[PDB]
Amino acid sequence: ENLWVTVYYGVPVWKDAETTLFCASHNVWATHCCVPTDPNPQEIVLENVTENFNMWKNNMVEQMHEDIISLWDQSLKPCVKLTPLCVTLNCTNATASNSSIIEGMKNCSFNITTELRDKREKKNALFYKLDIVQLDGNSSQYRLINCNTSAITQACPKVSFEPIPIHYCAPAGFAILKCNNKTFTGTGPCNNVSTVQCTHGIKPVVSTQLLLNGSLAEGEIIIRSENITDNGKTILVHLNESVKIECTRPNNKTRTSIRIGPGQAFYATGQVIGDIREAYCNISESTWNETLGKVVKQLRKHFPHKNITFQPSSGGDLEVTTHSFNCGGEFFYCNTSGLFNSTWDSITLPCRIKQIINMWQEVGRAMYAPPIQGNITCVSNITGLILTRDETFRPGGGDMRDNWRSELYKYKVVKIEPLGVAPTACKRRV
Amino acid sequence: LWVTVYYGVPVWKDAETTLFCASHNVWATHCCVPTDPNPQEIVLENVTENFNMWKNNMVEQMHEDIISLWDQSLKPCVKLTPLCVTLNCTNATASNSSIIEGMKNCSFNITTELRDKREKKNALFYKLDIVQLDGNSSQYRLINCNTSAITQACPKVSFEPIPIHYCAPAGFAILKCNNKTFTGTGPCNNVSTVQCTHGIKPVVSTQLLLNGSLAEGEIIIRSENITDNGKTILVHLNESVKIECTRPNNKTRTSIRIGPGQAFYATGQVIGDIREAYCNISESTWNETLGKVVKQLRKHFPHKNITFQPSSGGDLEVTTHSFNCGGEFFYCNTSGLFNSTWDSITLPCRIKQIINMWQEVGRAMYAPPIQGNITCVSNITGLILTRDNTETFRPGGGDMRDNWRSELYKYKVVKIEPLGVAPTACKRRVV
Amino acid sequence: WVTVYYGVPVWKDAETTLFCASHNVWATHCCVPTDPNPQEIVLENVTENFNMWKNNMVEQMHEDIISLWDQSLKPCVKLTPLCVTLNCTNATASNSSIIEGMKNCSFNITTELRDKREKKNALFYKLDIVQLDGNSSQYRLINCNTSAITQACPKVSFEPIPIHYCAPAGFAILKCNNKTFTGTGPCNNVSTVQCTHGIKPVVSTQLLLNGSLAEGEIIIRSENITDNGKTILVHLNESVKIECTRPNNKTRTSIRIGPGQAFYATGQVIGDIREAYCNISESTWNETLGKVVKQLRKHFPHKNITFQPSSGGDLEVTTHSFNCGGEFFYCNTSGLFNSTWDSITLPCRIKQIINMWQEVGRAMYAPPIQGNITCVSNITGLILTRDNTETFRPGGGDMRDNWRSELYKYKVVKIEPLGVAPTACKRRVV
Amino acid sequence: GFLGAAGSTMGAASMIKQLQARVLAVEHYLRDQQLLGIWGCSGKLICTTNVPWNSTWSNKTLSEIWDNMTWLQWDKEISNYTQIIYGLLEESQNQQEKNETDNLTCD
Amino acid sequence: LGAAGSTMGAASMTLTVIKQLQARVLAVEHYLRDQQLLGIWGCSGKLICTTNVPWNSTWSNKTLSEIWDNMTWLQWDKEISNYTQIIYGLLEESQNQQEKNETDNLTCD
Amino acid sequence: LGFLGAAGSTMGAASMTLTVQARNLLSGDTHWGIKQLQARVLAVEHYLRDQQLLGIWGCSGKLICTTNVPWNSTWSNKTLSEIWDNMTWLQWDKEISNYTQIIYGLLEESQNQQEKNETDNLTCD
Amino acid sequence: XXXXXXXXXXXXXXXXXXXXXCXXXXXXXXXXXXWXXXXXXXXXXXXXXXXXXXXXXXXXXXXXXXXXXXXXXXXXXXXXXXXXXXXXXXXXXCXXXXXXXXXXXXXXXXXXXXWXXXXXXX
Amino acid sequence: XXXXXXXXXXXXXXXXXXXXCXXXXXXXXXXXXXXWXXXXXXXXXXXXXXXXXXXXXXXXXXXXXXXXXXXXXXXXXXXXXXXXXXCXXXXXXXXXFXXXXX
Ligand SMILES: *[C@@H]1O[C@H](CO)[C@@H](O[C@@H]2O[C@H](CO)[C@@H](O[C@@H]3O[C@H](CO)[C@@H](O)[C@H](O)[C@H]3NC(C)=O)[C@H](O)[C@H]2NC(C)=O)[C@H](O)[C@H]1NC(C)=O
Ligand SMILES: *[C@@H]1O[C@H](CO)[C@@H](O[C@@H]2O[C@H](CO)[C@@H](O[C@@H]3O[C@H](CO)[C@@H](O)[C@H](O)[C@@H]3O)[C@H](O)[C@H]2NC(C)=O)[C@H](O)[C@H]1NC(C)=O
Ligand SMILES: *[C@@H]1O[C@H](CO)[C@@H](O[C@@H]2O[C@H](CO)[C@@H](O)[C@H](O)[C@H]2NC(C)=O)[C@H](O)[C@H]1NC(C)=O
Ligand SMILES: *[C@@H]1O[C@H](CO)[C@@H](O)[C@H](O)[C@H]1NC(C)=O
Ligand SMILES: *[C@@H]1O[C@H](CO)[C@@H](O)[C@H](O)[C@H]1NC(C)=O
Ligand SMILES: *[C@@H]1O[C@H](CO)[C@@H](O)[C@H](O)[C@H]1NC(C)=O
Ligand SMILES: *[C@@H]1O[C@H](CO)[C@@H](O)[C@H](O)[C@H]1NC(C)=O
Ligand SMILES: *[C@@H]1O[C@H](CO)[C@@H](O)[C@H](O)[C@H]1NC(C)=O
């Protein structure tokens, strides 16, 4: 054939690959993702290039998970332990400022050792019922929730966990491909693909039934699932219009610093000032009714005309039955019943508040959120919904990674392989 | 002639480096690196090499990793610090009579999950795990509360030995000796190159070498300076002796909560045969095995008939035969195996829950009890013997490196040295 | 035509990590043998800028020393269980007479197992103990207010053996060889070395001990002479011999804390009653200060100069604090700095809870040292601050000032092998 | 652009985590440089050899097909011969050096 | 460093030259960066390499050859410190053209 | 045959595998990963140090390189037929082990002198 | 509201001392307490930061007339006087501004709620 | 810190008034940490305002200027009932009290 091997370097080819991506820009996120972002991101149109994307198997979702857990632990590790407080609590009924009672709170007295490890004193603090477990029946004696399962630590008030956009960048030798076709939906070939080095910034917002502060779908509402005919394989609905949600805790809380040891203190909840309205979230009614109807119209493209209906979660604890909204740093567990209630000016969701949480289903670990003094107001953008199937749908919930997959679905990591060969009609001259 | 420079020359030097460990088990978790699915071996034709099993540093390196994994695996587990309390330790009864000396019913006052609450609890302990505080006052403590913390191993964590292959990094190679009569030191005139060693299970024992490979030829006696009495002799058998060990009773255990998610596991009661653990070695096999060892031993000591004596004395960790059987530590007598001059042999065996496997000053471990009964079966592949008219041999022992030298005797680690020069007829041209 | 050169003799100011190089902390980490025959190259016609107060090596060594200090103490005995109420009375020594500064204190400690509450006692210095209330025998240790106290283990020495710091490949250390260099200007006689000389990491406050004496006359170095907010480092060309002592035989006990832990504490003192004192040659001291002043007046030629026997702040800085073997001395310098232009026998105090580094949240407890102790040291410099006439006072107290005075002649630079220059020829084969 | 014209045919197309990442970047770099050098492409983006195309790796009339196939498709087409070709390229370069220093008729 | 500071024409033949991991890795990175740059330029393997880029008279006042040997490298580097990235870019462009011209002007057997 | 398989071959037969031995010098959770990281860093340094020597000797890019340094009969007085046909590389490495540092120093100086002569002494004026 | 009941004390002729305190209607210690002087003199001055909330300090009514003191067991607190003098022949009162965190030290942003009936021993 | 206000002889009804306090110390690093209280003859004091806001559970007839030197004029003086009232420099340990004029 008179052909000889010609070696070429700088060949535009690649392979699917999994590598370590790095993130870029008193805030924990800002401290860790200290690396500057690209002020002028580049993008290559990749003329005549098609590619296979698979969000459900995208390793970046899992890698982002590992980074959030790791960062959380670095931040929480060098802080006060509350295990010295795992004592019997002598509790009475709910109390409040002046002639009132706060349902959901209890006034508890406890025996705390002073810093000299000999003298002992009693202290009083208010606690949420959801953070307290009764020791026996017909008894006033209680203990803190989880003193029978794990160490409880206190988050340091000095550090902010407020989400900031995080940009992920591939290391040298790697690139990130993006699907920019729109209406991509689930897995499969994308016929409009481009190359970038870094992702858009994604804020690490953690929630359950409602996905907050993400990007909006371009075009129509997109329903993403893995084999949509299944009851499992949680469905991610990505809205093209946002819904404003305003959440609040309309009362003035105070904080008491209790010394618990040689360089340690606990932050206790003291008297609460103002009216007692618990907590709640405000959603416009017409906005919700129209938004849900549009979702249904898109469900009708996957399902035949059917008896489509929405119901509240069928069971489990607050972590899966409510909207686990972080708001201002106290944790909100808001009731979505009345939101996911339909058959095919505003409404409010009643909401509960907690201080002791187990984060990403750590279970064997727990964290205590110091109380926030004064009142709290939070406004967020609902950008997507999470649904599961029984055509009855319920919010269900995910593995707490759906709040990443919903943004990372358009990105893929590939290894660049610049070396290759092909035959040519040219023999080496010597 | 002129100097020519070469790169890629197939030569090497003795070298030291870090080898890769290839394989809810700790060894499997740690040695997460897969083994070569199809290991290669390249015979080096017309190559000789000098091997020395007493000085190759592969044993020392794995020692450090064995210790590191053992300790690291135990770190994220329950501490028994709060158990260092006065114990009553009265005579425990399994059934009928209170005649079992080994177990005591220890009652004590221990802090529970709430810091302001204390409870009266009890558990059964072995005599070998406790010490009397005041003679005849019936006050006892755990033996290691004298010097350090005792860590309870996690019940979900398996320390079961699995075969481990050690693999060279790029730039390094492992040379293997293929001489069945090597004896542990000197040149091998049949050498092959491998990337990874054969798998070795990290089995820890004393006196007898268990679950190793067998000698290719006849029994090989390997020792440094065998004529000295200051050296340990490793005897590598060419046939395995079957040994079976058991604890013939059903142990039921309790759980005492001592903190926010932490609990102590301990014997509640034992139902079954009240006797101690037993090990069984076939008699005919043992006598044949020993006779065969002697026939080869006579080549080094061709004199008066050899006497085999029991171990000389010292702590139980060095005088008896230790067993890593399941989760319980067996301390078995060898008397009757080493009482001779040159259908089963039943040997009594004690059990302990508190051990110090690596004789570390700062460490102690508590083994959670096995619920139910235990049967342990293994291959005796060799002996660790010491020597001290005729010769006297005893089932003595070393530092547990013997356990690894016995497999890692045929391997050497070398570094590749790609550069060199040689004379030629060709001078560099000006061009 | 642009000619490209590689291996070009150019360097730039840079900051990197220097090698630690070379039962003893310093030896444990600075465990790499030094160059047995250091080389040095004189750079003919080269001038370079050195600046003591901008020299990052001072700060780097400081951070590494702190790390070495903590790393060494970490794997040792905690004294946490001893932060209990103490019952203290007056201690006596030698005779039935009360020895001032010592108190005889008892306490209830667990020791073996649990619930023994064994009554133990020890002698303590008043400087380490704070009274709990008025008219009371009940006391607590001073660090119970902030943190745990770590006992230093006798197994390890902290003796300041000299360390030579070495640059990494790609870097070099430039040295100033001007005998009268003032610390901020250009040095017109420089050379290149790979490692610094051996600098002993000696800890002191007001006086600089065991350094290298000036090559020239006494050199007075400060960032700014005019600015009274700056520290003046006086580098002497002649040393002062200092002999300090604790003239008594201490006997110590060992109080079990728990498994693997024990407290070392003073049992009794037999010997002189004076706790400590120090011998400074009278003639040397008087002449030394006069010489400093004759040089000080060329920077401050104003009326008369006086050294006032005064200082401010607490005991850690108002005195001369130094180690004597493993002992901690706090000597009164009012007997030294008292003059306007045999031996001094200064009184000295002893303290055991040392807040080394003056950091909040850390303390170390110095075990008692058995028998009697003497130390000999060389004053190689002084630290002064000031403000018609001018008043100077002992200053310092900042540990970095003790190192800045030795590293003053060294600078770290990065080597930059590439560069270009114009030429006559174009590449010949194109 | 870096991967621009990836979809074009050959005629035109041819025209602690941080330390781990840095080490890998170096290892990938060095492998490409060693591998190009060992075949005779040191200092070149494109070079030729004396190793013939066997026709078994691919039996296509590539002198014309070259302009109607992309690098991505090609890379897949002959991926099974990667080691074979590379081994031949290594042998070719080594033999050339052995001929250069042949003592009978040296350089 | 070795000997240094002499007037540039005297520099001929003088061209003869967890923290621990960070230091070693960076030393490697710096080494390779210089080799990569010499690599893109037609300079790989050389201490001295000649270009296809004329010296641009706009950069400094070139008093013929005197500028090449009237000071050492330290002052020279300062005089043209603001052109280094320009000169390097020009050298890359020129070598890139050379690579394209050799690629197209194939000899072969 | 592969990797060190040619190690026992004669000096002449050996080297037909220089490429193989050279390519095999490159490599293609918790604390134990640090020891592995350290090993990788050192492997890179060793590779580069050999490349630095080939660079300074003027042998960059070649597996077989000649120089202008003559062979000194002091190092070895054997002829070529013995050296290339009977002797192996392991034996040779031992035979002249005490001259390696001399030859390497000579190679560096020879290359510097060559470059000194190659350098254009202002031909263009 | 603490609604504390003042315990009161006998008057003394510039002699001895008193720490009468007020008994709280609810809780003890906790984190809501205060002590003050009282007089027909621009409401006198705060006497002590008998704040509970794991802390206590003297206030500005007198540099060294009394020290803050408390007993959780008695549901009561007062500064305990010493060296009584005629200048001290005045009223005293209890209050319980709630505790709060305010960076360094403290500020009584919360009002002095629950003033006691008070007492006097002039 | 110091407090005083020119609220002497405040004999009035219907029309509310108060004098502003001296506010020697602003006492307003955050959230106006200053407060007002008043007492009827033969009565304990009670909060009137805090942080210039009507005190909780006190009265509708309460107001204050948004200033460190605020005057806590009643929103209305329809009830008359003049009584001594004063501000305190709550931010200070030395929370100095105003004259407590009617
Ligand atoms: C500029 O700095 C140079 C240092 O970088 C100074 O050079 C030094 O001068 C010393 C004499 O003054 C030499 O001392 C010699 O050291 C050797 C060591 O082995 C001894 O044997 C000799 O006896 C000793 N000579 C004498 C007379 O004692 C230093 O070796 C030499 N250093 C170097 C690196 O050469 C310059 O003097 C200085 N110039 C000015 C103007 O100050
Ligand atoms: C300033 O430098 C001097 C001289 O090196 C230092 O003096 C030395 O201090 C050490 C520690 O106290 C002494 O070591 C001890 O010696 C006795 C001798 O019997 C031995 O029994 C002990 O075990 C220990 O090794 C050393 O002898 C002493 N040197 C001299 C000449 O007396 C001084 O400590 C340094 N000062 C400062 C502030 O660093
Ligand atoms: C609840 O607490 C907040 C502060 O935590 C108070 O906020 C102040 O409100 C006034 C209103 O005029 C502003 O002028 C201040 O500047 C705010 N303070 C700060 C720090 O911003 C709020 O008033 C309190 N509410 C109640 C009912 O007491
Ligand atoms: C240990 O003592 C307890 C006392 O209640 C008894 O119930 C238990 O059976 C005893 N156990 C044994 C093995 O003797
Ligand atoms: C003693 O040695 C002889 C050979 O010298 C041998 O035949 C005999 O069996 C030996 N005795 C014993 C007990 O082995
Ligand atoms: C003050 O300075 C003058 C300068 O001439 C000197 O003579 C005098 O002695 C000095 N005063 C004192 C106290 O030394
Ligand atoms: C050293 O100090 C002692 C303290 O008692 C004193 O007696 C002695 O005289 C001093 N030395 C000199 C030279 O004065
Ligand atoms: C809180 O509980 C303690 C329990 O002893 C009780 O004395 C106290 O009065 C309770 N607090 C209130 C406001 O009722």
Side-chain angles (χ1 to χ4, degrees), chain C residues 274 277 279 342-343 345:
Chain C
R274 290 177 293 177
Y277 65 87
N279 285 100
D342 296 345
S343 69
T345 65

Side-chain angles (χ1 to χ4, degrees), chain C residues 423-425 428, chain F residues 120 123-125:
Chain C
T423 191
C425 298
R428 292 181 184 188
Chain F
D120 184 348
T123 297
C124 301
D125 188 354

